[PDB]
Design a protein around this ligand. Sequence first.
Ligand SMILES: C[S@@+](CC[C@H](N)C(=O)[O-])C[C@H]1O[C@@H](n2cnc3c(N)ncnc32)[C@H](O)[C@@H]1O
Ligand SMILES: [K+]
Ligand SMILES: [K+]
Ligand SMILES: [K+]
Ligand SMILES: [K+]
Ligand SMILES: [K+]
Ligand SMILES: [K+]
Ligand SMILES: [Mg+2]
Ligand SMILES: [Mg+2]
Ligand SMILES: [Mg+2]
Ligand SMILES: [Mg+2]
Ligand SMILES: [Mg+2]
Ligand SMILES: [Mg+2]
Ligand SMILES: [Mg+2]
Ligand SMILES: [Mg+2]
Ligand SMILES: [Mg+2]
Ligand SMILES: [Mg+2]
Ligand SMILES: [Mg+2]
Ligand SMILES: [Mg+2]
Ligand SMILES: [Mg+2]
Ligand SMILES: [Mg+2]
Ligand SMILES: [Mg+2]
Ligand SMILES: [Mg+2]
Ligand SMILES: [Mg+2]
Ligand SMILES: [Mg+2]
Ligand SMILES: [Mg+2]
Ligand SMILES: [Mg+2]
Ligand SMILES: [Mg+2]
Ligand SMILES: [Mg+2]
Ligand SMILES: [Mg+2]
Ligand SMILES: [Mg+2]
Ligand SMILES: [Mg+2]
Ligand SMILES: [Mg+2]
Ligand SMILES: [Mg+2]
Ligand SMILES: [Mg+2]
Ligand SMILES: [Mg+2]
Ligand SMILES: [Mg+2]
Ligand SMILES: [Mg+2]
Ligand SMILES: [Mg+2]
Ligand SMILES: [Mg+2]
Ligand SMILES: [Mg+2]
Ligand SMILES: [Mg+2]
Ligand SMILES: [Mg+2]
Ligand SMILES: [Mg+2]
Ligand SMILES: [Mg+2]
Ligand SMILES: [Mg+2]
Ligand SMILES: [Mg+2]
Ligand SMILES: [Mg+2]
Ligand SMILES: [Mg+2]
Ligand SMILES: [Mg+2]
Ligand SMILES: [Mg+2]
Ligand SMILES: [Mg+2]
Ligand SMILES: [Mg+2]
Ligand SMILES: [Mg+2]
Ligand SMILES: [Mg+2]
Ligand SMILES: [Mg+2]
Ligand SMILES: [Mg+2]
Ligand SMILES: [Mg+2]
Ligand SMILES: [Mg+2]
Lengths: 106, 246, 346
Amino acid sequence: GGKSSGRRQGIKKMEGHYVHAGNIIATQRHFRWHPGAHVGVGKNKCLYALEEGIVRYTKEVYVPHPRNTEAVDLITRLPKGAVLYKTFVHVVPAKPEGTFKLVAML
Amino acid sequence: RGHKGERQRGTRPRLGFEGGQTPFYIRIPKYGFNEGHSFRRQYKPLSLNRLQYLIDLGRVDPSQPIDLTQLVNGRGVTIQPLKRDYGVQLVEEGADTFTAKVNIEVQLASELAIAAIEKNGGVVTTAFYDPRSLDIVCKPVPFFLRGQPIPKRMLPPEELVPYYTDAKNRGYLADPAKFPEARLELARKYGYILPDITKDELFKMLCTRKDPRQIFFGLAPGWVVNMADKKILKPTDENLLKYYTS
Amino acid sequence: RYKKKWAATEPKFPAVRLALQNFDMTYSVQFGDLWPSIRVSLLSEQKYGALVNNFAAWDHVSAKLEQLSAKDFVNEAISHWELQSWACSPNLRCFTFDRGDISRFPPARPGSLGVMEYYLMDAASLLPVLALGLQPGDIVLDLCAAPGGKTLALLQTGCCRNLAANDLSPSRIARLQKILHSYVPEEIRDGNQVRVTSWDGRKWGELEGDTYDRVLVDVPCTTDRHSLHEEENNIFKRSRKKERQILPVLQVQLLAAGLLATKPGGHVVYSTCSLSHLQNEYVVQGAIELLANQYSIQVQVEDLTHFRRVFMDTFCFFSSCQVGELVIPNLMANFGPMYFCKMRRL
RNA sequence: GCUAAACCUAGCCCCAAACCCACUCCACCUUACUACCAGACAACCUUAGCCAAACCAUUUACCCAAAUAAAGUAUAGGCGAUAGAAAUUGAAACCUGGCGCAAUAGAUAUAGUACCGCAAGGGAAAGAUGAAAAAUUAUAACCAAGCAUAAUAUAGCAAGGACUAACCCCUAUACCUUCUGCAUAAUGAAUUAACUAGAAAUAACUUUGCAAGGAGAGCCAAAGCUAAGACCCCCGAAACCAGACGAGCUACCUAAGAACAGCUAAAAGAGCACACCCGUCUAUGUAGCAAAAUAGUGGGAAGAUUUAUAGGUAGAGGCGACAAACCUACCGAGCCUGGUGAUAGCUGGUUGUCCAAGAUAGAAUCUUAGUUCAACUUUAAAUUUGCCCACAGAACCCUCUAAAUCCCCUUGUAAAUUUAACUGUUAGUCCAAAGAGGAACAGCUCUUUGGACACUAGGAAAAAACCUUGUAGAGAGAGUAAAAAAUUUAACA
RNA sequence: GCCUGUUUACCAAAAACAUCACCUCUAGCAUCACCAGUAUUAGAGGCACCGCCUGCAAUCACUUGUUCCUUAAAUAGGGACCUGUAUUGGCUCCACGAGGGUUCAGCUGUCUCUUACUUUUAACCAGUGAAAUUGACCUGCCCGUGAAGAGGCGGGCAUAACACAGCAAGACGAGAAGACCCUAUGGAGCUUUAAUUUAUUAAUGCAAACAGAAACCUGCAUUAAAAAUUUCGGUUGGGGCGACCUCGGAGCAGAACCCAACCUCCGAGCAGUACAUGCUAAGACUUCACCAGUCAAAGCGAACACUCAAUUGAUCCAAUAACUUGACCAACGGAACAAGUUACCCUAGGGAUAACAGCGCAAUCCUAUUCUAGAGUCCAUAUCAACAAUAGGGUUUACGACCUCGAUGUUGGAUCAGGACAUCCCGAUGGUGCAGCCGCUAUUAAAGGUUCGUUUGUUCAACGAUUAAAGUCCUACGUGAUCUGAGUUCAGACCGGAGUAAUCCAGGUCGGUUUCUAUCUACUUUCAAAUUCCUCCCUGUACGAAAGGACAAGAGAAAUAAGG
Ligand SMILES: C[S@@+](CC[C@H](N)C(=O)[O-])C[C@H]1O[C@@H](n2cnc3c(N)ncnc32)[C@H](O)[C@@H]1O
Ligand SMILES: [K+]
Ligand SMILES: [K+]
Ligand SMILES: [K+]
Ligand SMILES: [K+]
Ligand SMILES: [K+]
Ligand SMILES: [K+]
Ligand SMILES: [Mg+2]
Ligand SMILES: [Mg+2]
Ligand SMILES: [Mg+2]
Ligand SMILES: [Mg+2]
Ligand SMILES: [Mg+2]
Ligand SMILES: [Mg+2]
Ligand SMILES: [Mg+2]
Ligand SMILES: [Mg+2]
Ligand SMILES: [Mg+2]
Ligand SMILES: [Mg+2]
Ligand SMILES: [Mg+2]
Ligand SMILES: [Mg+2]
Ligand SMILES: [Mg+2]
Ligand SMILES: [Mg+2]
Ligand SMILES: [Mg+2]
Ligand SMILES: [Mg+2]
Ligand SMILES: [Mg+2]
Ligand SMILES: [Mg+2]
Ligand SMILES: [Mg+2]
Ligand SMILES: [Mg+2]
Ligand SMILES: [Mg+2]
Ligand SMILES: [Mg+2]
Ligand SMILES: [Mg+2]
Ligand SMILES: [Mg+2]
Ligand SMILES: [Mg+2]
Ligand SMILES: [Mg+2]
Ligand SMILES: [Mg+2]
Ligand SMILES: [Mg+2]
Ligand SMILES: [Mg+2]
Ligand SMILES: [Mg+2]
Ligand SMILES: [Mg+2]
Ligand SMILES: [Mg+2]
Ligand SMILES: [Mg+2]
Ligand SMILES: [Mg+2]
Ligand SMILES: [Mg+2]
Ligand SMILES: [Mg+2]
Ligand SMILES: [Mg+2]
Ligand SMILES: [Mg+2]
Ligand SMILES: [Mg+2]
Ligand SMILES: [Mg+2]
Ligand SMILES: [Mg+2]
Ligand SMILES: [Mg+2]
Ligand SMILES: [Mg+2]
Ligand SMILES: [Mg+2]
Ligand SMILES: [Mg+2]
Ligand SMILES: [Mg+2]
Ligand SMILES: [Mg+2]
Ligand SMILES: [Mg+2]
Ligand SMILES: [Mg+2]
Ligand SMILES: [Mg+2]
Ligand SMILES: [Mg+2]
Ligand SMILES: [Mg+2]
């Protein structure tokens, strides 16, 4: 067998691209890119922007959740002083939540 | 024509064929989108903007009762009884700018359109026309050239009886005693002072309403119009009178 | 260009007929007058033994089976150890019917614990587990453990703290996981006690040397019971003729790897569901010579004559086997065919 | 200047109108066209199939008695290709015509004749003076191929540049079609003349009329509606079905006949051997004498023989000493007519001028000789970004730690996207590079990037793929690009 | 094969068919066949007369090996022996046959080796006067090149024009879209346990209708019979007894995406936990189309977008009150339901595509050097040679599918050959484990030559006798418009094998149509130098211990070749 085509998975929004709420940022088989600020992750590790703004990619310290046993057992065997890093994709909000407007003069 | 194949030889397959795979339209499941489409009732909408436009240009005279004949004669509507039309429906478009006192009879009417007419002192009544009588009403002249006696319009179907027996819809088969109560509710709901049309001079004209079995005004069913001699023939057979009056 | 106009074409035989013809020639000389008796039992449906699930309500199941006149041959055999005078793996309860009885056990019903009350399996397949002489606190390695005919029996004993169940075919492995899940409660399988993997058994001779004390090796072989009845994935079809030719070679290699995996002083039992002596004794002799010549490893084969006499009442044994013990099917006792040989490493 | 070439009528086609012919004498259902004896003889019975459904098996339009409209609506349908009403509505109507043909046209027609076939059946060709032929002193010139007038002189796709001059010099690999690519030794064409192949208006577009209305009833309408213009080929199967016609050849049978010297033998499916029949071997012949023969040599030659005559069995069949033989010179299913312009994803062809834009991602498919969609390409229209690209930015288990992409403001530039309407191409090649399969072979196979080629020219000898170079004309001007292989080797204490 | 007889009219006359004889099967009877008959008869078949034969498996036949006879020589013909298989079945015998093999003597131009003559044809004079064919030609050779075989392109050479008569190397010559493989959702025949049917026919049953029981008829059923309709999925595979078709991951594809096989590897057609695995809704992804597929804020309602790479099937239709459910439709974008065979084949095409050939390539094959280990008593190098290396050749076996599918079947022989030298013989010359003769090896040499026979279709080979030698190749595996048609190849048949059958066969056996009038190129007396063996002489000389035994020169004789 092995006639399967590619899944067309990768980066949908590069650095500096303007995105809207719900736009898919990246599709990946495994956690190559991790969700950052205002970025959600679906069942299939699909990264989608939770807010409208600009996409940024940074390197951040990876602190796994204590419940995730497999990742916790990995940082506990690291030499003292070593710190893990991973790539995170963030969305910097562009518009504010709202504005206060005059509606009447009572 | 290209090089060879079915293109140059003119043996192209039928439209929709996709070379062997299941066609796009075939693989879509069937749904009742158009089931019974030829039996659904259609009503040409008549906006108050359209009605007011006709009145201001003299195409429809408000001094006389307005029925489907006058709207067609004024080229306000184009009814197609062969296209499953059942009359006109009065819609609420342009109710704010409508200002005229008329006596118009429409097969269907919205609650707001009824309120708008009665606010200005008009009278609105809804009556049913069967497809056979509908063509006679729209084009009386072609019907009078067939030499046939005028038939009485049939009663509305069982499904439409509740609509025309309710005073809220101003049905022509409704109890006249419930009209005053229904008219006042619209005045209270939409906040307008209901005028007393009895004191008006046009009160007699507004009350002019045709019988449920009648087609035109003052033309009893069974009469034969002779347009060549400008004469009307009225049968005197007792059985014929009983047939055209019941 | 292919030629489709051959003068003579070999007639198409069913895979069942192909298996029957090959068995008829080979096994007639090997068994002599016993082959016709064996052949009918092979063609008839084998009797199914009901292996009580110890994790479930074993006592209540035993009472239920006694109503169906089922008799625990294992319990009877245990009392026969002193009567005739390593012992055998304890904590196994399998109920069968009388000799010549055709009654079939009803399908198993899950108990209040949510696990199946008992497992239906060939009674001749339980003997290698019993002959293994399992003891508590040991580490048991099983090669070709899937689908779990013998794999489930090991957990019922409760003598294995760590288990390594490896089968090359993932499809068979997937069946093993469901069987363990349905029968064995998740708490035992929760930890590293049961390790189910899908790799070549030849790797176990190098990756884990001397790790396990008890190793059970059931190499793949021409299954006489399955070949004569099943029509799917039969080894005797023309496409799989190549696999049958190289089948004895794999039997020698997989057994040798398991022998390297066991610790010296441990016990290794070689099991095979076939009547062909070229794949039962020659493979055993092949592995013994292979270790000495290549890795200089010596093993000793224990005598199963004492084990043979205990189950003579409920099983039919062939008394012309050089090293291993062969259980031949019979009309009265339809269990089999099964060949198991026990060797210890020194 | 010969052969020829021209020369307009005969007549026909489509409508309208109107409902048509059929006893001079004689003969004509028997072997028709035959004056003249005992008979019994009776007509009536669903069409099918091709074809479409990309096979095929249910199914698949065929005037059925009023145009239009309702309406391609209700319904029918492997609910699929396709089939398809009714109620109801109501139409004018003046034969004496032609933006029909003019001898390869128009009916086949000068004629259903000549001719062909046993029969059914098929089926032509052509004529041309003048008012006068009772003017032949006639109806003068020029015009296709073919010839003649008038054979030929080194050398070559027969020509071009030229030149004082035909050749000599220089340059030049016929045309069409089919393929990645044909001078190709791949297809077709001897040549001349005539004939011979793109039919349809749903949508959209363009140009008028009118306009919230349009239209000479019906229909459509949230700027539409009416009208016009403008897009959709030719030839060819093997087959299938229906109804007829054929056993004068042949296969077998029936009726009543005929033939078989001589010799040897015996009352012989005997021998030798004529007539006769048959056709073993060889040669000639191979468009022949002959669509099966000639010469010699052979088999049988009183029999299961040969043969004349009349009759019979007819295609879903006959008949057969079974050879798949024979059934009117192509019988694994005769011929003819009709369905029929059967169908063909296959082959071939597809006719005036000029200009412009214009090539290689794929998916599905009883599909890889095709088609549909996308990509690409074209026109029209709308709109605003398009391309190039500065940092920054895009993963770990993985150091072939690769070449390089994606994103991308400036900037250089002028395109790009969306809308409308459809066609067409996708059986590709070779070179460079990375990597697979084969053998670290192939003008080998299979992907990726890029170029070239199917677009011109120059140079590598000739040269589709290498190098130089493109946007088009004239010049008897000029400057340049790529562009010419190197190499000759052994004394010795 | 009993015999006479019969058959493919126009490629097969036979071993095939028929045939008396024998065997099997069916039928108890009238008024167009059988039959104006009646079990000693009629019909449907098999085998091919006659004669002979056991076990209760023998004998035989077939088969595997061995030997003998014939021939100078025997893959042939005849007989015997050994092994295995097979059995109702098998083995002999007359006669006969245009059947197929072997042979005796004889016969003969069949041949060694042709020759002469006549006749027809032929050529010329006179008369009459075709056909296939034809893009245009003002139509050369060599080498190279090219869609891979050039009269037309490149470079050289040759070259006044011109008819007639011959010739058959070329014009991939002409003649029937040739045969041969492949293709088509193109046909047809035939067979059947392909699919779909019983209308039709026949036999029963019931209803009907009757008598009083029955039959005929009609309707509806069930059995068969005999027919009818239609189809023969693709992918890959020269020596097989098949694999494969959908979905997912890893390598190629190293870094956004995408990216193929005959590829390189492993799988998937589930299970488990939930039971709000509820209801709705911005904005996006999308397996390069579509169909499908994936994520998802907020909100409502509750709690306090399940795990898993794949784990899946559209429409119609059926079921259902409804909600919902239904195909290893796995050929997995799925036709509601259809298999073989054709060499009796047909049509439309295909050099996209096979075999032969040409061409590419050099794994294989072949050859010479380099290396010096090792054989050769000693000794690498008189010879021979390992592991390898370096080049050349295009003769085999393969690989590629580029040219030819709108008339070359291939093999071999006959005829006539041109060419290469990597030389079998003749010539010249080094070395030698060369005394001389014989030999071995190497350089040089293509002027000349290189046999006749038996079985075999043979090429080749075996052995028969010879020769100074009986060379290796190429040339469209030369030459078939010069010939042959034996093997293979179309229709017949048989033996053996496969298949239910039709029918098939890399096997054996028998038979089986080989067209052409020369338009063009080329050519049609190379005006004339010959090679070889044997014998003799030198000479029984040199050489050698003898056995043996030569050079060069000269002579004679003979043979072929060339020319008379
Ligand atoms: C005959 S079954 C034995 C089943 C099991 N041992 C029992 O008795 O119940 C043999 C199994 O060995 C597995 N197998 C085959 N080859 C293997 C290999 N190379 N390494 C490990 N297992 C293998 C196959 O999947 C097969 O199911
Ligand atoms: K096709
Ligand atoms: K004959
Ligand atoms: K004969
Ligand atoms: K020639
Ligand atoms: K399919
Ligand atoms: K030819
Ligand atoms: Mg992949
Ligand atoms: Mg064409
Ligand atoms: Mg008379
Ligand atoms: Mg008379
Ligand atoms: Mg069709
Ligand atoms: Mg077909
Ligand atoms: Mg004419
Ligand atoms: Mg002329
Ligand atoms: Mg020149
Ligand atoms: Mg017929
Ligand atoms: Mg006759
Ligand atoms: Mg006589
Ligand atoms: Mg005779
Ligand atoms: Mg005869
Ligand atoms: Mg003969
Ligand atoms: Mg004759
Ligand atoms: Mg005779
Ligand atoms: Mg007759
Ligand atoms: Mg006959
Ligand atoms: Mg026959
Ligand atoms: Mg035949
Ligand atoms: Mg004929
Ligand atoms: Mg056609
Ligand atoms: Mg242009
Ligand atoms: Mg399909
Ligand atoms: Mg005979
Ligand atoms: Mg006799
Ligand atoms: Mg013949
Ligand atoms: Mg003959
Ligand atoms: Mg016979
Ligand atoms: Mg005879
Ligand atoms: Mg002789
Ligand atoms: Mg003459
Ligand atoms: Mg001619
Ligand atoms: Mg010349
Ligand atoms: Mg050449
Ligand atoms: Mg040249
Ligand atoms: Mg000549
Ligand atoms: Mg000649
Ligand atoms: Mg196809
Ligand atoms: Mg039909
Ligand atoms: Mg997409
Ligand atoms: Mg598919
Ligand atoms: Mg798919
Ligand atoms: Mg044959
Ligand atoms: Mg030499
Ligand atoms: Mg040849
Ligand atoms: Mg030849
Ligand atoms: Mg020739
Ligand atoms: Mg022959
Ligand atoms: Mg022969
Ligand atoms: Mg001479």
